[PDB]
Write a structure and sequence with these properties.
The structure holds 2 protein chains of 2 kinds. Chain A is about 0% helix and about 0% strand. Chain A is largely without helices or strands. By secondary structure, chain B is an all-beta fold. Chain B has a single domain, classed as SH3 type barrels. In chain B, strands 4-3-2-1-5 form a 5-stranded antiparallel beta sheet, with no helix packed on it. In chain B, about 25% of the residues are buried. The chains are: A little secondary structure, B mainly beta. Chain B: It is found in: Cell membrane; Mitochondrion inner membrane; Endosome membrane; Nucleus. Chain B: Forms a complex with polyoma virus middle T antigen. Interacts with AFAP-110. Interacts with GJA1 and PXN.
Amino acid sequence: APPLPPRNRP
Amino acid sequence: TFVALYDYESRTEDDLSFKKGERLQIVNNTEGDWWLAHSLTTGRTGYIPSNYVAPSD
């Protein structure tokens, strides 16, 4: 599975 | 709509867990690569990693 994206920035 | 390409286990209280093959609708994508989605399959709502889904008709 691909790496997860960074969490969203506000 | 989108279709899940992989299973995804929630890693935060805000995430949506899903199985490969579930069909999802995007509620909002304005915050980044994590999209707020609603599973048409399960009825649950939460954030998903956008690279785990593909578009569907």
